[PDB]
Amino acid sequence: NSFSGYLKLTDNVYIKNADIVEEAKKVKPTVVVNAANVYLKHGGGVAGALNKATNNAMQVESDDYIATNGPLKVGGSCVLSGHNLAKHCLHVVGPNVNKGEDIQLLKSAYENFNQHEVLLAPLLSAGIFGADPIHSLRVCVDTVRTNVYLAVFDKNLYDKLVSSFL
Ligand SMILES: O=S1(=O)CCC[C@@](O)(CNc2ncnc3[nH]ccc23)C1
Ligand SMILES: [Cl-]
């Protein structure tokens, strides 16, 4: 495939220091994962950045989804359009530790990835969602069985994740 410069961690997990928006724009993958919240309010982090790159079309689509279906569950997901970034966007809600949500729900969140053969994704629950990215990577490796290409925004963190992996 067109994913370039990823370090192989396991049979099915690959990692790169990259902005997921730029990776999506260049590769145009079948599935890009959004680090969503239950309301699909794409304000910041991965979600705000993906939505900005769609010129707010992701938010417009998401507001119609919520008006029809109500909020997602923490640990849940929905498939919506990938707009100009991907064929599909898989919106996945990891627990927000800053809100006291159960970190055990991170495994449930990653299980959604197993419904898709290949994904471009961030580390769920990390960044502004408050969880330890080292833990998020371990849960990913131990939960996802399909092929996942992880884009880590921060270089300092990327290097720490690689160095501490084996
Ligand atoms: O500070 S972090 O590296 C800690 C680990 C999770 C993060 O990677 C999640 N946020 C992003 N990841 C990838 N591309 C992105 N574009 C815009 C935001 C963004 C941020
Ligand atoms: Cl973030």
Q: Whose CA is nearest to atom 20 of ligand 1?
A: 127
Pocket of ligand 1 (CB under 6 A): 19-21, 45-46, 49, 122-123, 126-127, 133, 151-154, 157
What three-state secondary structure class fits 133? helix
Is residue 126 a contact partner of residue 110, using CB atoms and an 8 Å limit?
A: no
Residue matched to tokens 């417009």? 60
Residue matched to tokens 């961030």? 122
Q: How far apart are CA 98 and CA 95, in angstroms?
A: 9
Atom of ligand 1 at shortest range from CA of 46: 18
Atom of ligand 1 at shortest range from CA of 133: 5
Is residue 9 a contact partner of residue 164, using CB atoms and an 8 Å limit?
A: no
Set out the domains of the chain in order of their start, with CATH numbers.
7-162 (3.40.220.10)
Measuring CA to CA, how many Å separate 86 from each of 15, 25, 50, 115? 19, 8, 11, 16
- For this entry, resolution in Å reads 1.0
- CA–centroid distance, 128 to ligand 1, in Å, is 9
Written as one string, the DSSP assignment of 49-106 is HHHHHTTTHHHHHHHHHHHHH-PPPTT-EEEEE-TTT-SEEEEE----GGGT--TTHH
- CA–centroid distance, 18 to ligand 2, in Å, is 13
Q: How was this structure determined?
A: X-ray
163, two tokens: 């160095």
Q: How far apart are CA 58 and CA 38, in angstroms?
A: 15
Query: For the purposes of burial, counting CB atoms within 10 Å of the CB of 39, is it exposed (0-12), middle (13-18) or buried (19 or more)?
Result: middle
Q: Chain-centre distance of CA 6, in angstroms?
A: 16
**Residue 33 forms beta bridges with which residues?**
90
Atom of ligand 1 at shortest range from CA of 154: 3
Instruction: Specify the amino acid at residue 52.
Output: K
User: In testing the pocket of ligand 1, which one of 17, 20, 158 has its CB within 8 Å of the most ligand atoms?
Assistant: 20
- CA–centroid distance, 10 to ligand 2, in Å, is 24
Instruction: Specify the amino acid at residue 86.
Output: A
